[PDB]
Each structure stands twice: as C-alpha cells, then as structure tokens.
Amino acid sequence: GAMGSMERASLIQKAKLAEQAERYEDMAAFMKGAVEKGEELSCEERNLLSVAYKNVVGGQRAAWRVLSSIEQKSNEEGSEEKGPEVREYREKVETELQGVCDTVLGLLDSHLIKEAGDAESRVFYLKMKGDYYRYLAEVATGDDKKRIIDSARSAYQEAMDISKKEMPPTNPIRLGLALNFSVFHYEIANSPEEAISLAKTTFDEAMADLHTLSEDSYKDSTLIMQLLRDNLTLWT
Amino acid sequence: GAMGSMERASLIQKAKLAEQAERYEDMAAFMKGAVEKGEELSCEERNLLSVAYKNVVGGQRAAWRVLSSIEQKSNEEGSEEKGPEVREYREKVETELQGVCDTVLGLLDSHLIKEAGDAESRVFYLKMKGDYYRYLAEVATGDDKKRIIDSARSAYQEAMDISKKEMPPTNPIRLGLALNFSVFHYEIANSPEEAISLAKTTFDEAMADLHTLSEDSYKDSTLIMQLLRDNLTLWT
Amino acid sequence: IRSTSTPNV
Amino acid sequence: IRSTSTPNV
Numbered sequence A, B: 001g002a003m004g005s006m007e008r009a010s011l012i013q014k015a016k017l018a019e020q021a022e023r024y025e026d027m028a029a030f031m032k033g034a035v036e037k038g039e040e041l042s043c044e045e046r047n048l049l050s051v052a053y054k055n056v057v058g059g060q061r062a063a064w065r066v067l068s069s070i071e072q073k074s075n076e077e078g079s080e081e082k083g084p085e086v087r088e089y090r091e092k093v094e095t096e097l098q099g100v101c102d103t104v105l106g107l108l109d110s111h112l113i114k115e116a117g118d119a120e121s122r123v124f125y126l127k128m129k130g131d132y133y134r135y136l137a138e139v140a141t142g143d144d145k146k147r148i149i150d151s152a153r154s155a156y157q158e159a160m161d162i163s164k165k166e167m168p169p170t171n172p173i174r175l176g177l178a179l180n181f182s183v184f185h186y187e188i189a190n191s192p193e194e195a196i197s198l199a200k201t202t203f204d205e206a207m208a209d210l211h212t213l214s215e216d217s218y219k220d221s222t223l224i225m226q227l228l229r230d231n232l233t234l235w236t
Numbered sequence C, D: 001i002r003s004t005s006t007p008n009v
C-alpha cells in the first residue's frame, strides 16, 4: 500500500523517529511497510514491530474496557434507557481493535512465521500470534469464541515446545512467552491452577540458571521474573 | 461528511463517551459532526469541542517538537549526514498539524463566530481562533509567518476588547484568554515585556474581584490565576 | 522551558 | 485487577 515506494531502511529509520515522538500509529504503519518488503526482520526490527502494535492495540483495549463497563452498567435493573449509542460506540472501537489484530495476524501468516527458522525468531512470532488471538478472545462473545481461544492456545503451545528445547530458561523471549501464556490461562481459559503452575515452574527454573549470566543478561531476566512473581502474588 | 447521518444528540453523547475512553480523535470527529448540524453550541458543548481538538493538536505539537529538535541537531557541524528522512517525517507531522488547525479555523469561520452574539460564546470562539493561528505560527517559517502572527494577534485583540467590556475580571474565559494572549506575546511575538505586563495587570484585577464570588467560582478563577503567576515566575 | 497556556478543564 | 503481561522494552 502507501509505503510501497519508500526504501526499507527509510521505513526502519522513520519507525525509530515515530517511537521517539510517541507516534505509535505511524510507527506501526512504517513497520508494516518494512515487513511487506519481504525480507526477514532482525531482532531489533522485531522489537520495533512489537512495540508499535502493542501500543496501538493497548490503547484500543483500554478504550474498549471503559466502554464495555459503561454498557454493562446500562443493562442493569434501575438503569434509565439511554438508546443505542453506548453499544454502537463500543462496537466501533471493537471493530477497529479486531482490525489491528487481523492486520498483525496477517503479517505473521504472510509470511513471517513460515520463513522464521531460528528459535528466537520463531518463538517470538508464535508468541505474537498467541497474543493477538488472545486480544481477539478478550472481545469475543459469539460462536467463534471457542475457536479463537483454541487458536491462541495452539500458538502459545507451539512456541512453548520450541522454547523449552532450544533456549535456556532465562532467555527473555522464553520468559515473556511463559508470562503471557500464564495470563492466557488465568484471564481467558478459566484455568487459574494451570496459570499458577506455569508461573511457578518458570520462575524456579529461571532462578536456577541465573548464575550462568552476565550482569546485563541478569538484569534482563530478573525484570520478567519479577512480573511472574507479581502475578503469583495477585493470584494466590 | 461521515457524521451527516447521526443525530446531533447522539454525536454529543458519543463525544462524552470518547472523552471517558481517552479517544480524542473520535471525540473531535463527533464534535465536528455536531457543529456541522448548523445549530449554535451551548457552554458544555463548546467545552467538548475545545477539549477534543486541544488534545489532538497537543499530541501533534509535542511530536513536532521532538522531530524539530532531532532535525536541528542533524544540521549542525560534526553531525553525520543521515539523508532526508528526519525532514520528511517532520514535514508529515507538520502537515497533519496544519490540517487540524485549518479544520478548527474552518468551523469557526463557517459559521460559529458569525452566529455568536453573547460574550461567553464570542470571546471563547475568538480566543480559539487566536490559539489555532498561534499553533500555525509555531511551525511557520515562510513568507506567511508575519501574516499568521498578525491573524493570531487580531483575533486575541478582538476577544480582549469584548471581554473587558462585557465580563468581570474573574470570569474564567476572560482569564484564560488573557493567559493565552500573554503566551502569544512571550513565545511568538518576541514581546516579553508586553507578556509580563498583561499577566501582572490580569492577575491584580482578578485578585481585587475575588470577594464577589461564591466558593465554587472562587476555586475556578484562582486556578487560572495560579497559571499567570507560574508564568510570571518563569519570565522574571 | 515553555510558558503554560490554558489547560483542559 | 488484571494480570500483568509482557511490557514494551
């Protein structure tokens, strides 16, 4: 589309500028343009893609939750009827969120995952696939809610199997995947016990491997481990 | 345009929802839709219009400043040449900002100002006109910089003359106009002495009129007076 | 660094 | 209220 005439290196340069300017919609469009050049992405470029889309969808999710709460309050007894506007606007925001998730899923399917052969790239993209199905699940209510949940689970499970065979237990991508799969289990799949088990086993195996790390790698791994502990504190 | 088929009351309802959801681009499009129905706006509806567009342009101004600083650093001696990307992206953001200012100016010209006959409405819309010319001036560098600055000054001056004849010195719209005209003088018109004089006289005349106010009106007026004092502290 | 203008209220 | 997922880093 609109980024077809810009050089790949100029799209990456401008994504970095858009990050500094907190222009995340622009950042996402620059990175979608870069992916569509057809070349694989390096680690730093996967980070730019992830940051851009997480910020865009994160705004949409926050907005959707505010509107869903208002809508739920409207549909209780004692609530004066206000017309179709709250539902319509929640639907508008929901549709836009679904569109961003479908855009990301489409980049991963065409053709990021199929060309990803190293563990860091393949685990990252499969985690991303699980995350964006998870965001679709958060808003799903129809006959496809179960299939959307199963799509997220399958992606996370494929990523988990590769991560456990190919990466050390302190690898940040491995840790971040396990964190988000544990969130899936607790918040989407009605499986709090599976969530707690995964977060505990992940934390314990990482703790045991910290001695192998440099000071800088240690700081990276312990950051995510603190998130696992914060969730265990919340869940128990 | 796209809001032509929605009821005015539903556009206002949805602007309030978009405010709660921090969806300011949507809020602005709902309020532009409401203005285009052709009816005058009430005080609360002028507030929704002002909040929506101030948030949108405020994001653009912040982004433009980050990019302009990077561009200026690029054009200094010792700086490695990086190509046209920083200038191009600053230009993209600048053009979008100019477009939002032209949209607001167009609503005021077609036909909010001409139908505004009460002091609160006319002073508010003329202040808004001065503000959006001021934002255009912030990014102007060409042969029209002087005419843009003069456009802002003329709008603020017309608003000032009405405010001094028709409103008490503690009226929040009168105070906010004088605050922003003093910012014009200091930051745009290279007139720091005029800025300091205006802010001092405005603060002193409001202080002398506070005794006439209710507790709630007092809280409103003293909030803006603190901003005048913060600027005087900064400027002196 | 920059002067304060009217806020959103 | 909601569980923490991976942040932007």
Ligand SMILES: *CC(=O)N1CC2(C1)CN(S(=O)(=O)c1ccc(Br)cc1)CCO2
Binding pocket: A042, A043, A044, A046, A047, A048, A050, A051, A120, A121, A124, A127, A172, A173, A174, A176, A177, A223, A224, D006, D007, D008, D009
């Ligand atoms: C090197 C590589 O491929 N990447 C992608 C990443 C660096 C990591 N991912 S993530 O979602 O795996 C993640 C891990 C750890 C944290 Br604290 C946050 C996110 C995000 C993009 O950058």
Ligand SMILES: *CC(=O)N1CC2(C1)CN(S(=O)(=O)c1ccc(Br)cc1)CCO2
Binding pocket: B042, B043, B044, B046, B047, B048, B050, B051, B120, B121, B124, B127, B172, B173, B174, B176, B177, B223, B224, C006, C007, C008, C009
């Ligand atoms: C009643 C009325 O017309 N309005 C418009 C306003 C309430 C006030 N304006 S403002 O820009 O004059 C302003 C004054 C004071 C402060 Br603290 C902030 C802004 C903004 C929209 O609401």
Ligand SMILES: [Cl-]
Binding pocket: A088, A089, A092, B014
């Ligand atoms: Cl809508």
Ligand SMILES: [Cl-]
Binding pocket: A014, B088, B089, B092
């Ligand atoms: Cl650009």
Ligand SMILES: [Mg+2]
Binding pocket: A007, A008
């Ligand atoms: Mg090329």
Ligand SMILES: [Mg+2]
Binding pocket: A078, A079, A080
């Ligand atoms: Mg009732």
Ligand SMILES: [Mg+2]
Binding pocket: A091, A094, A095
């Ligand atoms: Mg729907």
Ligand SMILES: [Mg+2]
Binding pocket: B007, B008
């Ligand atoms: Mg009607």
Ligand SMILES: [Mg+2]
Binding pocket: B078, B079, B080
């Ligand atoms: Mg050099």
Ligand SMILES: [Mg+2]
Binding pocket: B091, B094, B095
């Ligand atoms: Mg230009």
